[PDB]
Each structure stands twice: as structure tokens, then as C-alpha cells.
Amino acid sequence: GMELQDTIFKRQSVRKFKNQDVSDEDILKMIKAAGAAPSGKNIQNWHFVVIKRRDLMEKIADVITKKQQEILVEMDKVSVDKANRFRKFVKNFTLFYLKAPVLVLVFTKVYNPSGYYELELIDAPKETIDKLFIRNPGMQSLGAAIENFTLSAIELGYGSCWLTSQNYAADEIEAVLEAETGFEKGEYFLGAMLALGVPEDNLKSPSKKPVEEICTFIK
Amino acid sequence: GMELQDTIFKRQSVRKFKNQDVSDEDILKMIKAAGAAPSGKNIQNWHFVVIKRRDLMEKIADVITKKQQEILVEMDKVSVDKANRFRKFVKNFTLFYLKAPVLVLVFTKVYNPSGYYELELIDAPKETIDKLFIRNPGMQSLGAAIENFTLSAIELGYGSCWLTSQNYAADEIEAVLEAETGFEKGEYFLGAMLALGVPEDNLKSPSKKPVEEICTFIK
Ligand SMILES: Cc1cc2nc3c(=O)[nH]c(=O)nc-3n(C[C@H](O)[C@H](O)[C@H](O)COP(=O)(O)O)c2cc1C
Ligand SMILES: Cc1cc2nc3c(=O)[nH]c(=O)nc-3n(C[C@H](O)[C@H](O)[C@H](O)COP(=O)(O)O)c2cc1C
Ligand SMILES: [Cl-]
Ligand SMILES: [Cl-]
Secondary structure, eight states: BBBHHHHHOOOOBOBBBBOOOHHHHHHHHHHHHHHTTTGGGGOOOOOOEEEOOOHHHHHHHHHHHHHHHHHHHHHHHOHHHHHHHHHHHHHHTGGGGGGGSSEEEEEEEEOOOHHHHHHHTOOHHHHHHHHHGGGGGGHHHHHHOOOOOOHHHHHTTOEEEEOTTTGGGGGHHHHHHHHHOOOOOOOOOOEEEEEOBBBBEEEEEEEEOOGGGGGOOOO | BBBHHHHHOOOOOOOOOOOOOOOOOHOOOOOOHTTSSOOGGGOOOEEEEEOOOHHHHHHHHHHHHHHHHHHHHHTTOOHHHHHHHHHHHHHTGGGGGGGSEEEEEEEOOOOOOOHHHHHHHHOOOOHHGGGGGGOOOHHHHHHHHHHHHHHHHHHTTTOOOOTTTTTGGGGHHHHHHHHOOOOOOOOOOEEEEEEEOOBOOOOOOOOOOGGGGGGGEEE
16 A cells, blocks of 8 residues: 555656556546545535547547637637647647547536525525536546545556646547447546546646745634 | 545534534634635635634624514514424524534635526527526536535534525624624625534434436436
8 A cells, every 4th residue: 555645745747657557446546546535415516437448439539629620710710829838738638648648638617606596596696606617526426536535546566647738528438438339427527537548657737836925714 | 634434424514512612723624625625716715714703603693583574573473384384494504503613604705607607698588598508607606615625524523514504694693793703705705614622422314215226327
């Protein structure tokens, strides 16, 4: 096993991977850890789709690219500068996931949080109800589950990168998954993906805020 | 220290606390761990306000109650039973934090995710851009931080409950904090609270989904 703080401070966004496998049994451990995460009213708004199928990983890449190109055709009319930065960004911060042996699609569902049905019952303005979602407790919950998964990967000798940069193409990703596998998402939609494998060594991360910057102790 | 899985499977929502203090040094270790969480584009959209001052904790409770009562007097006109369910809910799942020695207010700020500025650039429909936020990557990031805090609390001999049920009164909570401490939130807003202490014995958690239900291995 591995001690908690060790895993926490070891954690990086892994974007380069060794040519080694990740066992289904180890992935299942990661998922059990995710499943034990806290969630708003125990909604447990998560479902992990584990993909090792190369052609499916590549088909998902292709749909991201198709959607990205549709956006780029319009961006080029406004600012080739901005369009070109987007071209580089998707390459380096989305499609790098093909470098890993495992792609995990994390599906989720909307959690209507405390206050929502109470305010709806009394015909509160939508503007008031919307304020509950600026701090989206449903996505806090998803993040707790994905962080449990992430730390457990590290304990088991692996590492990962969390991804939401694909989500302008989420509908298209869901569609190809369904065509290729018959997976039925129901009310769920894509929340995040994880690129998962054995990390290369000597990976880099940006500096973080000093702990004293991110807190205030009231005296 | 404590091994990761041991911490993950020890974690419960702690709503009853022993009469014992939490050291500032230990709380700082929790926040340092929180600050190591991944976040979209390294935004680190979190600030932890640590409160031990009893009168401020009570003042926060009173604005939660006052806001609750404004909702209740309208709910009673539609459904007294539903209003009664909300009365019980707020006692059991919100105002119990007063039972702990420490209240942490977790402030956060909006993260405009990938796709946002690109779609804005090309005057994409607001309804399209809104879809990025149904999986709010900023709040996924916040959840990752608060989970790191949560697990660290357990390793150090404490426990906590995560709260978002107060957030129909978030603005009012922020106003009390500001009025009583001088804290300047700037662009940040209340995301969650944590009730933090040495946990009571015999804590109960609800039944969870079986792991087979929360994953799919594509074959
Ligand atoms: C973002 C989020 C918000 C939550 N808000 C509350 C809350 O306001 N009050 C409460 O009593 N529990 C709250 N919880 C705890 C959940 O009720 C709890 O995690 C769930 O019932 C599972 O129970 P367990 O944590 O003991 O395993 C919250 C959890 C999450 C992650
Ligand atoms: C919800 C969220 C979404 C993220 N999306 C992406 C992404 O699409 N592409 C990527 O390369 N990294 C992504 N990341 C990783 C962050 O860029 C990374 O956590 C941050 O830069 C800090 O680097 P570190 O994780 O190595 O410490 C995401 C992280 C979070 C938590
Ligand atoms: Cl993003
Ligand atoms: Cl809530």
C-alpha cells in the first residue's frame, strides 16, 4: 500500500505513458474507491466506462477532431491567432490521451441540490434557483469520486490525467460510444475522461499557490 | 500515517463530534493537501476560511434559519407536509455543524472551461455554451480539493461532513462573514462548508450502489 499524503503529493497530470498494461482488476479497485466517495444526498451520480479498445479510442478522437474543425472553420474567420492556439491546445491537452493504454469515460447526471425542489414548489424565480448551480454540488460530488479514482491509480503504480477539454464534443462522443458498443447512457452524460497508464518518469507540473494564499484562519 | 484505501473506506459523513479540539497545524496540513488537487488549467479555484469562533458559527446559523423561514412560510401555503419535511431536513442535514469545534467555509470562483472562449469568439448560441457547464469542470476541481481535505482529516484522526445544503443562503452567509471578520471574498463565493472535528463513535452511512452498477468494461 501507499500512505495518503505520499499519494496526494505524488499526483500529477500524466500526459506521457510507458508501454505497459493496466489490469482490469486494478482498474476495478480504482472504481470501488470512486464509488465510496461522498455525494449529495447519496446520489452517486457516476458511471465509469473503461475502454481498452484501440479502434474505439481512435473513433472518439476522430469525433472530437470533427467537432473541433467545425469550430475552427468559424474561428479562422475571426482570428487565425486564436484559432491556431486552439489547434495546438487540442493536440497537446486533449488528444494526447491516445498515448495511454486505457481511456476511461466518466458519465454523470444532474443533481438538483437542496433548495431546488423547495424553491420550485413556491414558484421562485428561475434566476434564484440558478444560483444553486454556480457551485454545482453534483459536480463537486463527481470530482470527489474522480479524485478517489486518481489517488488509487497512483497507489497501484499507475497515474492519469483528468480531462474535460473534450466536452464541446460530448454529445458526439456519447453518440459514437453508443453506436460502437450499444452502451445505454440513460439520463447520464459525459462529465470527464481519464487517460490512464504507467507514467513516464520526470513529468512536469506548474507551480501551485502557497498554502498560506489559499486560506484564512479567523481569529 | 494511514494507507490510502484505509482512509477512503473509513470516510463517512460525520454529523456528531466528540468534545475535543482540532489543532491549527493539523488543519493547515488538510488545506495543503486540498491545494495539491488537480484543477482545470491549474485554476486552483478554492479558498478555505477556518472558523472556531462560536459566535460567528451561531451568526451563520441564524441567517440560514432566517432564509429557511422565508421559504417555509411560502411552502406551508402549498404543502404543509413538504414544508415539514424541509424543517426536519435543515436540522438534521444543515444546522448539525454547530456540533463540531470547527466550521470551514470553502470559497470558490467560476472556471470558464475549454470551449467557452472559442464558442464565444464565434458567437455560438448561449444554449450551446451553457452545455459546458452541466458538467461544471470548476466544481469538479473544487470537489477534488475538498476530497483531498476530507481524506487528510481522517488520516490525522478527525472526520468531517461536506455541506452544500446551506447554499440557498450563501449570499447571506458571506455578508455575515464579511461584517464580522473583514474577510474580502473578491470574485469568490461560498462553494461548500465542512463540519470538522473528532468524530463520535458508531457512525452510520447509507447503502451504496454495487460496483458492477457503476461501471462498464468495454470488450
Ligand atoms: C457536494 C456534496 C454536498 C453535500 N452536502 C451535504 C449537506 O448539506 N448535509 C449533509 O448532511 N450531508 C451532505 N453531504 C454528504 C452526503 O449526504 C453523503 O456523502 C451521502 O449521504 C453518503 O454518505 P457517507 O458520506 O456517510 O458515505 C454532501 C456530500 C457532497 C459530496
Ligand atoms: C476537472 C478538470 C479538468 C481537466 N481537464 C484537462 C484537460 O482537458 N487536459 C489536460 O491536459 N489536463 C486537464 N486537467 C489537468 C490540469 O491541467 C492539471 O491538474 C493542472 O494543470 C495542474 O497540473 P498537475 O495536475 O500536474 O498538478 C483537468 C483537471 C481538472 C481537475
Ligand atoms: Cl475544460
Ligand atoms: Cl445540497
